[PDB]
Amino acid sequence: MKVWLVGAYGIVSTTAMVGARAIERGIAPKIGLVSELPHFEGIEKYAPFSFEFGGHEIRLLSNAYEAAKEHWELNRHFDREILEAVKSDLEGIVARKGTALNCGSGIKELGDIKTLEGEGLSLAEMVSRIEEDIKSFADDETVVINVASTEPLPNYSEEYHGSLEGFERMIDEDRKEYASASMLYAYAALKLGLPYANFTPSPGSAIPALKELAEKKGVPHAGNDGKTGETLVKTTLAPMFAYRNMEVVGWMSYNILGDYDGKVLSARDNKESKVLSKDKVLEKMLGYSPYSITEIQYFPSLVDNKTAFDFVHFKGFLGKLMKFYFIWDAIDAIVAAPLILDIARFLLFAKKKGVKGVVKEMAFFFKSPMDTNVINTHEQFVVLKEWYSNLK
Amino acid sequence: MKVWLVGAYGIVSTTAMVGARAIERGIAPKIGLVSELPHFEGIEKYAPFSFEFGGHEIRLLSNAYEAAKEHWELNRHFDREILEAVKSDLEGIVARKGTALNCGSGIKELGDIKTLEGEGLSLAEMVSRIEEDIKSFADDETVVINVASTEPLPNYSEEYHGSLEGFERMIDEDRKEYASASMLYAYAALKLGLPYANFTPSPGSAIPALKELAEKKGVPHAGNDGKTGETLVKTTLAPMFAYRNMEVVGWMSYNILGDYDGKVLSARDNKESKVLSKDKVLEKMLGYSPYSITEIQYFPSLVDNKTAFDFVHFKGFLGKLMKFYFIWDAIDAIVAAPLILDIARFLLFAKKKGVKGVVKEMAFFFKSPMDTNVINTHEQFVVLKEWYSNLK
Amino acid sequence: MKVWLVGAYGIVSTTAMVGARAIERGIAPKIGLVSELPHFEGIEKYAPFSFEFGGHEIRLLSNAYEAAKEHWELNRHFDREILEAVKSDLEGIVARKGTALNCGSGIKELGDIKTLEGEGLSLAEMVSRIEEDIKSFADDETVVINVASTEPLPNYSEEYHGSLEGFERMIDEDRKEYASASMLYAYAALKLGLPYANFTPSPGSAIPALKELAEKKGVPHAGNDGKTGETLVKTTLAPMFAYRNMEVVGWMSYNILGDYDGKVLSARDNKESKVLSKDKVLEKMLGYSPYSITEIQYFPSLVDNKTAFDFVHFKGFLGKLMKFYFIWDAIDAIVAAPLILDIARFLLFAKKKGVKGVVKEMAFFFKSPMDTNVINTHEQFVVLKEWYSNLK
Amino acid sequence: MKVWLVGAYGIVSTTAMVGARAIERGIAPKIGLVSELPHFEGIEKYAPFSFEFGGHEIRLLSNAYEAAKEHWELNRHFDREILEAVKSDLEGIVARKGTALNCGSGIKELGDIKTLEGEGLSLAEMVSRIEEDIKSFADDETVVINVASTEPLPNYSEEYHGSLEGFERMIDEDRKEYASASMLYAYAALKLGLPYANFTPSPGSAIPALKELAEKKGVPHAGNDGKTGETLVKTTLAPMFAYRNMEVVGWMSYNILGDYDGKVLSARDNKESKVLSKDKVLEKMLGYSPYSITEIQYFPSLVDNKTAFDFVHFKGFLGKLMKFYFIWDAIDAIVAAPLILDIARFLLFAKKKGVKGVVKEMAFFFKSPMDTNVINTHEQFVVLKEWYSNLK
Ligand SMILES: NC(=O)c1ccc[n+]([C@@H]2O[C@H](COP(=O)([O-])OP(=O)(O)OC[C@H]3O[C@@H](n4cnc5c(N)ncnc54)[C@H](O)[C@@H]3O)[C@@H](O)[C@H]2O)c1
Ligand SMILES: NC(=O)c1ccc[n+]([C@@H]2O[C@H](COP(=O)([O-])OP(=O)(O)OC[C@H]3O[C@@H](n4cnc5c(N)ncnc54)[C@H](O)[C@@H]3O)[C@@H](O)[C@H]2O)c1
Ligand SMILES: NC(=O)c1ccc[n+]([C@@H]2O[C@H](COP(=O)([O-])OP(=O)(O)OC[C@H]3O[C@@H](n4cnc5c(N)ncnc54)[C@H](O)[C@@H]3O)[C@@H](O)[C@H]2O)c1
Ligand SMILES: NC(=O)c1ccc[n+]([C@@H]2O[C@H](COP(=O)([O-])OP(=O)(O)OC[C@H]3O[C@@H](n4cnc5c(N)ncnc54)[C@H](O)[C@@H]3O)[C@@H](O)[C@H]2O)c1
Ligand code: NA
Ligand code: NA
């Protein structure tokens, strides 16, 4: 299959590329791949473990190898021998110039960038470039996945975001104020009939306009925002207090990281998207709102080793308060990268099975799953299992 | 209903007694009670929140109030005002002298004790005293629950434990070497046609002899070993690594506590029962065995504030190792006490619904659930929900 | 001796009052009191353990007992029996209306308040009321200690803060914009010839004007900002990396608390004072600046149980990065309250020994010690010991 | 200078060798080296940063490079580029066959071993081989340092360990039952007039016989047992509670590690030496004994990444209990290796300054410092500083 990655030179993106190729060359295990679990036996009939890559970027380096090595230098999150073995393949992946339209002040932290809007192009002309890039790459086994820096919350508009006609009016009128990069890539993917997933908390396809578009075009889509670490634990663990009829009175979630993701989320406007997505899961699972605090702070020496500190304050029998702590110490690109490969395969599977619109049953992958109040990790896993069985 | 508690002066036992009465007098919330969750609406048709108590003990204090206050003095795990309000009721609960037969060297740590076997009685004569105590108390709405100190692993015997005839032969021949206290209380309960649950990792009714007996008598029973804290988290959290196709390579579980439970488990023979029950859950959930260490150590200043330290070492994409820590800081009697009330109500419900033999669907309460490989907390909760719906 | 407490109805203040009296009535140990350590034998010649209290407040409750009980209800940080035993004594402590001039937006969180500036008084007239209150209480064995809510960083002024003449000009001209409450109480104390200590990060006497005043008047003073918990650990532990020639690359300090202190510090202007005081210690000890983040967030269920989460990222041999975590779980009023009693006794001792100006050797008590670059806890303790020996 | 390392193929030993050479070739910083701190300016007059290595082993691999690479493969605790750069130098370091006499059951975990006692040699003949090996290597700038696996507590003997004549009688009579390997290497070093340090909790030179010998020979020696991680923190942090007049009621110290050190300490007899050395520090600092538990458990996936979990339970004002947690996550060979280089330089310095007998002022390096009750890390550092200034 083929995967077009928005933010193709990022660490999540390059590590998926490194991993896919290491696994194909037979020099890496299949650990981390949800699509490789026993329940999904037979997926390879529809989506074999076979990947060609391209994508859009605003940080233009020569190729995906140079991009992968920049992240490897700082993080060393896989062996030098894996880097070397996949060098050839990754040198042939060259990203195209994308758009950073309305992606917030945090984009400044990426350093030297070049964008379509910087060239003076209108919305219609930007869409045409994005579509031409994708369609020149795409086949009938192609998916588009957004793994680009997290945008701020969009300037929402009922007219421009509430219907497909309103959104196409937005493009026609060149109303840039209401367009964000993530919307434009999602729009392009679906207009081309390509399945789409948004691994970030940027709006992407999660506006009514684009949900209408995906349905009309009969195209499957999924999102939003990869559930990889702290939020994974929160949605696995919060149900335990509910099952035991305990009241959660407080939940603290504090996250420190560096690298480009920590750099972008250092900006208050970009951060808000990620923070709300991490925070809001609690009420959906419990039925009520514990006092919750969720923060992300830049902490440069950790690079992509995002570390989370959580504290849960809870009541039990007779009103007695009790306390639970956790620390997650993990590399973000290592828990994220396989989910990109899994999302791509499950979208391809969904496409071939005639699935259209939001694939709500892929909620398991996401912190803010579209079209569903199923948040509990256990419930989401059962939904994913049962969905695949129903269509297999 | 009526509940006969083996180990009636213990902290789990007295706090269930304090709690039941506080809730009946309308001075405490219903927090902590699984049987009070919305899904179990209508349980009160079969098992209303209404409790009379008695039980067996080897530490003879005057009454359950004096017992409750001894634990309250050291722990202050509920308000002085709750203690005062329930004093009358608890002063009327007087335990009967039980048996500490083959309950290990840790029983020495309980201080001043008096037992049936100390009086020179044979197995048959001990059984008669235990039965007379229970039957003088029991009605058609009576359950027996074991919350006594954890025994060592029994001297197992195919002849004496493998069939009811073999076990009754054991009693007839006065073969004390193969009898443990917990077996004798379980035997007595079931011979009397009373539902039974074992909240400890002592063998109790979990031998083939007594499982045969419960079936023959048409009596429901449940166990073993309350899942309250660290093991609750382990069975909620370990599935997350499986769902995400990660390999757990190591899991460390270190527990410190004081009070009478920490005192008994300071002995190496008593400890082994609790340790194996906490440790063995991992393989059943994952399909394989991470290097696991599970310890319990005495740490007197914590009293009944059992604190657990866990560390999970796990592999993800490309073989990368990553790390997860947790600390549970809770009072053991507060997470355990409501489960005693819930177990009693669900046993009464099961009894009235014609349920007989091991109620395997009550696995949710237990670290070592009888007759089931369902260990995942989420799965167990669904099984409990669905079981109750099926019989309601 | 006599202690006039600014913020007399606060939890630190009332717990010092509760503690002093419990210890005098012989119903509490002397644990927590630095002045009770063997090295300080003979202090009781100059400052016996004997305390009468008064102070200023803006939250007017009837008396210090009602104030103490309000905090006890929420926190239960000492026994009901201690509360009862000291009720009489504390009912006779009645605070006087003080000033909340330029104490930031966080003061709004205190609820119902009444202030001198609210009555329409000028700076000169406010100073006269504050002085009249203190002088009506004071004797030759009286000290004034600031334990009031943390102010924002002041609008600094060279003219008005840089010399005593400039500060007295400020009062004469009624230039309120440059006066803060803490400055006015410190000014009043020193004008009256009374020793002064500032337990908060508010400016207090730590401006050149008031340092000049204390010297001229021959009056000892000490501050700023009680070092009680997280910062205590930081100044004990950071030296270990220096002694071992390790580079600290990052230090994260995250603090959650409730109660009135957490409420006031929820405001961004008030918070800044506390944050800088906690953060700045690192460079002074190490000679360089690790990337440091220090936050305080409101977390209401913890009440006065301030909990801190720290993470230290450090380099050792060959550049290898390594990691250290800590969690402090303590009640803030319990670690602070004895230091108020100790500060008072050491100020009285200093006064009687002819000490004047900043008592820099009391740095041990403080996060931002005036007139000293001695920050290491070990060094500060030796300085305090040696100071007392020199004057004994 | 020259350093003869007992246990020369171990990870602490090989990493000191790797580090020394990387630093000499100018490809590594001097981070981690206490002897490189500003206070020790001028040490290079007596002990320049210049090292030639040899030693004894029982695991015979071809050379120290092969040994270093075996540990590097599993741990990756320095760059492949450092490994490559020092390969030549380390290939020329070839260990000689030593003795594992009475080194406990844990020695079995080292795999394929060869020893002097296995050849049938008497004590006198073993001593001669050990001496011949060392003297063939040694010059006037040579030190011997023990970094071999931790032995069990020795079979102590007043006659054989209490005087030099008694110890030499032991050798003469071939009384193996009372000799341990570490004693024999220490004996040989001192008989040869070479300074000696013991980085392990094995007895080494810490018996009266060998202390008498070092004095008579006018030879400086130091030990015992490198203070590198958890115990470093404990001796830095415990003084904080004393300075603040708090009572420590409980201290838990739980350590997990793998590699060869974790393997040897998995044995109960070997473990006891390390456990007592880690545990006993508390009383010496505080004056009393908190309930303390100290454990080390094998946890193979961590390899040389020893992780420690500590919990401190402490009383403060009015008897209130409060709680402090810490987690140390570090590589043991990285914190240990520079101390070997520092110990060697400070021993050479001591030798040239006419120092003889136990260098008690090197206590800073050690968990069980010989001839001193100075345990507090801060105090030890001041003692080391002042010692060096006095002799410089
Ligand atoms: N576990 C995880 O790492 C995880 C989990 C959930 C969500 N996410 C989200 O995934 C995204 C990727 O994470 P990452 O660590 O790879 O960050 P990264 O910064 O290393 O990668 C993002 C890449 O996208 C590029 N980019 C930014 N805006 C773009 C635009 N509009 N068009 C094209 N390219 C653009 C950047 O130049 C960068 O190379 C982030 O938004 C992050 O918040 C990551
Ligand atoms: N969260 C929890 O507290 C928890 C969880 C799982 C299992 N358990 C188990 O529940 C049991 C009770 O815990 P606890 O904290 O109340 O301990 P406890 O020691 O305070 O209570 C046990 C009581 O039973 C008595 N006893 C011991 N052997 C007896 C015998 N053979 N016959 C009659 N009485 C006997 C003791 O005197 C004591 O009063 C223990 O076995 C414990 O391991 C507790
Ligand atoms: N361990 C600790 O608790 C600790 C450590 C260091 C510093 N501090 C500082 O000590 C102070 C007291 O802490 P607390 O927990 O008692 O808080 P608290 O809010 O319970 O006490 C402060 C009291 O002062 C009053 N107040 C505020 N402004 C005033 C003014 N200008 N004049 C007179 N009264 C005023 C408030 O009404 C309140 O009763 C805070 O500034 C805090 O940041 C506390
Ligand atoms: N931070 C630390 O790593 C640290 C701190 C304090 C003490 N120590 C102690 O230092 C020692 C070395 O630690 P390591 O991690 O290098 O362990 P290691 O097992 O990797 O090294 C010990 C080496 O000595 C060898 N050996 C064992 N007995 C011997 C004998 N009698 N004669 C000659 N060689 C012998 C072994 O074969 C091995 O190569 C251990 O005793 C350990 O407990 C280490
Ligand atoms: Na805690
Ligand atoms: Na870690």
Cα-to-Cα separation, first versus last residue of chain A: 18 Å
Radius of gyration of chain A: 20 Å
Largest interface: A-B, 53 and 53 residues
Shape estimate of chain A: globular
| Structural class label of chain A | alpha/beta
CATH topology heading of the largest domain in chain A: Rossmann fold
Fourth-tier CATH superfamily name of the largest domain in chain A: NAD(P)-binding Rossmann-like Domain
- Give a list of the ligands: nicotinamide-adenine-dinucleotide, sodium ion
Which oligomerization state do the chains in this entry correspond to? Answer: homotetramer
**Which percent range fits the helix content of chain A?**
40-55%
Largest sheet of chain A: 7 strands, parallel
The CATH class of the largest domain in chain A turns out to be Alpha Beta
- The number of helical segments of chain A is 15
Please give the CATH architecture of the largest domain in chain A.
Answer: 3-Layer(aba) Sandwich
Strand and helix order of chain A? EHEHHHEHEHHHEHEHEHHHEEEHEH
Number of E-type strands of chain A: 11
The neighbouring-strand order within the major sheet of chain A is: 3-2-1-4-5-6-11
Query: Strand content of the residues of chain A, in percent?
Result: 15-25%
Structural domains of chain A: how many? 2
PDB class: isomerase
Keywords: NAD binding Rossmann fold, L-myo-inositol 1-phosphate synthase, isomerase
Assembly: tetrameric
Entry title: L-myo-inositol 1-phosphate synthase from Archaeoglobus fulgidus wild type
